[PDB]
Design a protein around this nucleic acid. Structure first.
Lengths: 110, 92, 1084
DNA sequence: GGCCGCTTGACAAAAGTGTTAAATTGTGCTATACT
DNA sequence: AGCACAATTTAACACTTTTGTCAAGCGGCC
């Protein structure tokens, strides 16, 4: 997606600094595979923050990958690459062909 | 070649010092004042095209011929480079 | 006119010539074949190689399906989309409990196919690929170039498919094993082979000098992993991916005939495989009976020509590799949400990575569609440059003796050019047959009706080249043989037997490429000389004329159909053609109308057409010609009467002379097209739209040939005109101060869109054929996001013929048109017909000798006698053959004169007084015979239309062949001033009106300063180019008044000081006073 | 007396301040699975 | 793969007011 393995380490391990801190020692679950998540969530919250783009919040990466999975969803269920407007129905309200084209217009890594 | 170019080398001790004089003169032979040429009589360089006889807009050629009339002078002379404007001033 | 000069024409040339392409999508692409059978090779090949992706949860691969492509032909060469057909196989993940979830053929993705034409269509550019070459797998050892010590260099299955195995023998630790990148004793690893002592020594064989490395199994694995990489074995022979000589040939069939009996396919599987037979054939090699130390030696018997079939099979695999990796990640996360064999597989990795190969990969060069012969030379071009390590032009360690000739008559010796010699050649006509999939295989006749194909390695009872035959048993007595290198006089088994195992070349065309055999008298020139001429047939720019060269081998009979330049005729006949732009049908089977290409379009700006030739009904089986052809006869250039002689100097060095006769008949004329494209961006700030009311552009030149925006079709337009006047609200420059005055003074107001249009480029004086509006709102057009209205117009233009251009026939004599004197002058023959073209020697005749003049002598001969002789390469057509022909031509020529009312001219009599003493013509009877023999080896007296008196001396005249290269003059010239500019680069480059450009080579400045030029030299960097703030000074000065230019202020220097300032380095303009430390950069 | 020039009044068109509506971050935090 | 709350912050648009331009009227000069 974005940032090398070395880079991903930063935002990743850093997620422990704030994870291990807010640990509910109460429940009888014992800390283990928990921060395993406080890292990836920090990664997704990072890969969206840092990338070869300009400014992609949590309202664009989630949409790009959504329009991506959809473009690959209809593709695996059609036989040909779906256009821009033919993807509107795949989404829902507000998503037509213009705004849907504005999402793949900005960037994601190009 | 140039009409009597070889004769230009004989005078100047160097082939490079000649060029400088050619332009240095052309700078104050046509641009400064078209009326500063020693060659005015029938020796005045002129062209002959379909129209008639007129003076070539190029002055670089005049220098080669102007530095052959025996007149003019070159070399380290007159330190004040701002005095050239004074002499040119009298020539309007 | 059929003067066949070919003897014994046995088996025809290997058809359809374009078999490399067929055997590429028929051997690999097992699509149009029931999955029930078929081995691997291709899809099902790399498809199965993909081991059952682990994680039960195991996705299995089965079956496949191709065909029914989205957009058919033409719909791609017009919209840009390629001919990518959808391919998908049936998958089904499986896991412990009931997990037989089989998807519906699992719709995967697309995949570009091949057309019967033998090419591909990528981005409407229809490009073609070129198969590469490399030393096939196996152990060749390779003789040590440095010091005497034959080492080993085992070749991997493929350059990008395995760690290069090697075995060198030096001092410290003799016989060191090294693969990919390793430095460890052969013994240390030999142990892992299960053999450490007693079984490896004495049983098979400085060897076990390191007994401490051959004791424990595990230890060997630990010690090895410590020597390689920083402070792995899973590959190198193990599993199928790094080392695996699959397929069943090349890599497989090697050691079986080299090392020894026994082979599994891949080395060290840890059971040894090639680590034993190597030292076995090595120790026995050094000072042993079984030599065979024969290195690669550029031996084609080892050179593998991996066709497109396997060329894609690997890339496809590499792409499918990620898919398997992606599935794994999909199996590590989630379980019930979304995990089905259709979601875990995306049509992006195995697609995008598979498409970028045809659009960008060198080999996929822009299909040179200059002419039929050019497109066919690609499938046979072949090269060694590419993804392999045999690339790198100019240099590359040691390739001096890698591009040089070789003992392989299966490949020509005059196809390359310069920058890349040996790397770019071509395939033979009688090459590439049978199971070409592995190694090349030529043809060999047994003197009896039969042709065998025992590969190139053939060496059975030597052989003989087609030379002097006599009913199976040539009474030559000295059968010209040629075994291996030299040719030991002869052999002649002296028996009625078949032949010397394969002593027969069948045809002399087997040597040279099918492109060289086309050449008329290909046997009187040098390699280099014939080289250039051979390349001229790649850019001979087709012509509607195509008179077809007098002398032409009977090989072009297939260059018109195989290249599919023209059309064909199926079954019966009965055309009843309506002609026009749509050939009728035939009473053979049904009613099918054959639509012409309608001038179509070229990738080199040529545009080929195809005029028919029939009416009422006829059949045999040509039907309508093509680009540059005539009656199934390949006609590239044009043949015209020429005369060798100097004329005032209008042909110095190696120039060419032309008459006005050619232009009067538009003999030499071509067509050049160019596609335009104006996209209407949407920068949000202001969307662009095409209108016919451009601001400030309010004029007639618009409304007259524009209207509604796009220009009307069939409207002749010249450079400096509008074509796609788009309007953009893009406001970059607001109104200027004193500019607001000249805007209010007139009757007009302001603006908010600016002119901003296309504006014809520096060269376009023709007419439009048709436009094409491709704006959004149409899901059938894959365009760039945010783009609307993609105008696309086609502008044509007649070429005619000015001055310059390259002629270059089919031998090497290339030149340039100097001056075209209108009829009047030029050598006037003693019966009219003024010399149309004059070809004076100098350049190649004396120096790089050749054989083109042998065409002239037989040119006028075929003119009078009315025939077009055929001269096959290395067969027929010789000096004495011209004698018999000249006789008939003379009596026929002089015949008219002698019977017209005259005979022998005074001016035609003095010329004899020349040859007489000149030793040319023998003295004896009247001028009648003296003028006869003078015609056999020469021409008539000939005169001069300019001067007045005839050229004192026997001058030659006759029709040969005058072609025309793609390189002309119009589109090869440029001129500019201060108009050009390329901000950021600080140099003249780019422009929406003029794309001017000019470079001042480094080897040029030194010469300029060599003279007394110091102000002229600096000037090149004073006002122009560099000093941007200075570029004005001069141009602004001259326009206003005289004055002398600025002292100079470099622009790039300021950028250099800045770029170099990125670091500590402080480029200070230290003044001569030192202490002041001058600095010029403070915005002045 | 008539004509020309200058000044003032009216009308039309486009800003500073206000008002409100839409987006990001953090954090919270969520949450689920594995050890 | 991500939704909310809140909170807070960012962005823009619209109003009423003001400013500018045009036409009409009045005064002065010829």
């Amino acid at each position: 997606r974005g940032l090398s393995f070395l880079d991903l380490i930063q935002e990743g391990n850093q997620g422990l600094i704030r994870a291990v801190e807010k640990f509910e020692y109460k429940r009888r679950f014992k800390f283990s595979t928990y921060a395993t998540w406080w890292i990836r969530q920090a990664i997704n919250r990072a890969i969206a923050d840092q990338a070869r783009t300009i400014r992609i919040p949590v309202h664009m990466v989630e949409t790009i990958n959504k329009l991506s999975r959809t473009a690959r969803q209809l593709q695996q269920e059609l036989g040909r690459e779906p256009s821009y407007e033919e993807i509107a129905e795949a989404m829902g309200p507000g998503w037509d062909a213009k705004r849907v084209e504005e999402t793949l217009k900005i960037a994601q890594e190009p | 070649a140039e009409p009597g170019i070889d004769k230009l080398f004989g005078m100047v001790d160097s082939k490079y010092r000649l060029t400088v004089v050619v332009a240095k003169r052309a700078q104050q032979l046509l641009r400064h004042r078209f009326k500063n040429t020693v060659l005015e009589p029938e020796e005045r360089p002129k062209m002959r095209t379909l129209e008639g006889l007129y003076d070539d807009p190029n002055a670089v050629t005049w220098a080669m011929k102007e530095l052959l009339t025996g007149r003019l002078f070159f070399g380290e002379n007159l330190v004040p480079e701002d005095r050239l404007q004074k002499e040119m001033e009298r020539l309007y | 006119e059929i003067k066949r000069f070919g003897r014994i024409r046995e088996v025809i040339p290997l058809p359809p010539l374009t078999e490399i392409q067929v055997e590429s999508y028929k051997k690999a692409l097992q699509a149009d074949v029931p999955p029930e059978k078929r081995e691997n090779v291709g899809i099902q090949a790399a498809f199965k190689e993909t081991f059952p992706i682990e994680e039960g949860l195991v996705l299995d691969f089965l079956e496949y399906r191709i065909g029914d492509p989205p957009f058919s032909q033409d719909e791609c060469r017009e919209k840009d989309l390629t001919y990518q057909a959808p391919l998908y196989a049936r998958l089904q993940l499986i896991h412990k409990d009931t997990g037989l979830i089989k998807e519906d053929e699992v719709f995967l993705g697309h995949l570009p196919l091949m057309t019967e034409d033998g090419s591909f269509i990528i981005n409407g550019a229809d490009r073609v690929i070129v198969s590469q070459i490399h030393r096939s797998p196996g152990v060749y050892f390779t003789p040590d170039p440095a010091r005497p010590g034959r080492y080993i260099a085992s070749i991997i299955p493929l350059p990008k498919r395995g760690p290069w195995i090697d075995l060198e023998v030096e001092a410290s630790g003799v016989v060191t094993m090294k693969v990919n990148k390793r430095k460890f004793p052969l013994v240390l690893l030999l142990r892992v082979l299960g053999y450490d002592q007693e079984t490896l020594v004495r049983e098979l064989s400085g060897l076990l000098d390191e007994a401490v490395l051959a004791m424990r199994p595990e230890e060997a694995m630990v010690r090895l992993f410590t020597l390689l990489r920083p402070g792995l074995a899973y590959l190198f022979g193990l599993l199928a991916d790094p080392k695996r000589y699959d397929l069943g040939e090349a890599g497989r069939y090697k050691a079986e005939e080299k090392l020894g009996v026994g082979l599994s396919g891949r080395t060290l599987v840890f059971k040894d495989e090639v680590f034993l037979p190597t030292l076995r054939y090595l120790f026995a090699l050094t000072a042993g009976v079984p030599g065979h130390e024969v290195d690669d030696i550029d031996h084609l018997g080892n050179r593998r020509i991996r066709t497109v079939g396997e060329l894609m099979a690997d890339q496809f695999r590499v792409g499918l590799a990620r898919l398997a990796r992606g599935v794994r990640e999909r199996m590590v996360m989630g379980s019930p949400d979304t995990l089905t064999p259709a979601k875990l597989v995306n049509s992006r990795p195995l697609e995008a990575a598979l498409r970028e190969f045809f659009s960008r990969s060198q080999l996929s060069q822009f299909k040179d569609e200059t002419n039929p012969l050019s497109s066919l030379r690609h499938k046979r071009r072949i090269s060694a440059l590419g993804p392999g390590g045999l690339t790198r032009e100019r240099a590359g360690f040691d390739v001096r003796d890698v591009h040089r000739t070789h003992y392989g008559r299966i490949c020509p010796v005059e196809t390359p050019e310069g920058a890349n010699i040996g790397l770019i050649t071509s395939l033979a006509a009688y090459a590439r047959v049978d199971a070409l999939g592995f190694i090349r295989t030529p043809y060999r006749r047994v003197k009896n009706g039969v042709v065998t194909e025992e590969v190139v390695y053939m060496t059975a009872s030597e052989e003989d080249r087609y030379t002097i035959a006599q009913a199976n048993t040539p009474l030559e007595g000295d059968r010209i043989a040629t075994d291996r290198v030299v040719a030991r006089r002869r052999g002649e088994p002296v028996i009625v037997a078949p032949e010397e195992v394969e002593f027969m070349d069948v045809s002399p065309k087997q040597v040279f490429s099918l492109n060289t055999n086309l050449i008329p008298f290909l046997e009187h020139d040098d390699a280099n000389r014939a080289l250039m001429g051979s390349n001229m047939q790649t850019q001979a720019v087709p012509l509607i004329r195509a008179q077809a060269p007098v002398v032409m081998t009977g090989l072009e009979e297939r260059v018109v159909r195989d290249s599919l330049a023209a059309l064909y005729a199926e079954e019966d006949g009965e055309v009843v053609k309506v002609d026009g732009t749509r050939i009728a049908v035939r009473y053979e089977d049904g009613r099918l109308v054959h639509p012409l290409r309608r001038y179509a379009r070229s990738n080199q700006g040529t545009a080929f057409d195809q005029r028919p030739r029939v009416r009422v009904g006829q059949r045999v089986d040509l039907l309508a010609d093509g680009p540059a052809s005539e009656e199934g006869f390949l006609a590239l250039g044009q043949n015209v009467l020429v005369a060798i002689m100097p004329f005032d100097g209008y042909n110095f060095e190696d120039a060419i002379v032309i008459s006005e006769e050619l232009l009067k008949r538009d003999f030499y004329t071509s067509i050049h097209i160019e596609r335009y494209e104006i996209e209407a961006r949407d920068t949000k700030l202001g969307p662009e739209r095409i209108t016919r009311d451009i601001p400030h552009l309010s004029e007639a030149a618009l409304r007259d040939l524009d209207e509604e925006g796009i220009v009307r079709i069939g409207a002749e337009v010249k450079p400096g005109d509008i074509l796609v006047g788009r309007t953009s609200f893009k406001g970059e420059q607001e109104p200027s101060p004193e500019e607001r005055l000249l805007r209010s003074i007139f009757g007009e107001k302001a603006r908010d869109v600016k002119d901003t249009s296309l504006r014809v480029p520096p060269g376009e004086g023709g007419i439009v054929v048709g436009r094409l509006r491709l704006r959004r709102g149409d899901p059938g057009v894959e365009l760039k996001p945010g783009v609307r209205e993609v105008v696309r117009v086609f502008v044509a233009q007649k070429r005619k013929l000015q001055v310059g251009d390259k002629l270059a026939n089919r031998h090497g004599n290339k030149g340039v048109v100097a001056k075209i004197l209108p009829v009047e002058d030029m050598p006037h023959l003693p019966d009219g017909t003024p010399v149309d073209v004059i070809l004076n020697p100098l350049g190649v005749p004396s120096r790089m000798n050749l054989g083109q003049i042998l065409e002239t002598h037989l040119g006028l001969a075929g003119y009078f006698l009315g025939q077009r002789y055929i001269s096959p390469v290395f067969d027929g057509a010789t000096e004495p053959e011209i004698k018999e022909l000249l006789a008939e031509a003379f009596n026929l020529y002089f015949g008219k004169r002698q019977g017209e009312g005259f005979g022998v001219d005074k001016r035609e009599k003095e010329v004899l007084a020349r040859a007489e003493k000149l030793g040319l013509v023998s003295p004896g009877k009247s001028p009648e015979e003296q003028l006869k023999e003078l015609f056999d080896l020469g021409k008539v007296v000939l005169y001069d239309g300019r001067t007045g008196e005839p050229f004192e001396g026997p001058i030659v005249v006759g029709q040969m062949f005058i072609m025309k290269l793609y390189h002309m003059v119009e589109d090869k010239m440029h001129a500019r001033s201060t108009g050009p500019y390329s901000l950021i680069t600080q140099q003249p480059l780019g422009g929406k009106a003029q794309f001017g450009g000019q470079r001042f080579g480094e080897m040029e400045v030194w010469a300029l300063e060599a003279y007394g030029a110091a102000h002229t030299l600096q000037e090149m960097l004073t006002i122009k180019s560099d000093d941007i703030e200075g570029r004005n000074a001069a141009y602004q000065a001259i326009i206003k008044g005289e004055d002398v230019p600025e002292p100079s202020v470099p622009e790039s220097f300021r950028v250099l000081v800045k770029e170099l300032q990125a670091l500590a380095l402080d480029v200070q303009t230290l003044d001569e006073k030192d202490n002041p430390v001058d600095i010029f950069e403070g915005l002045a």
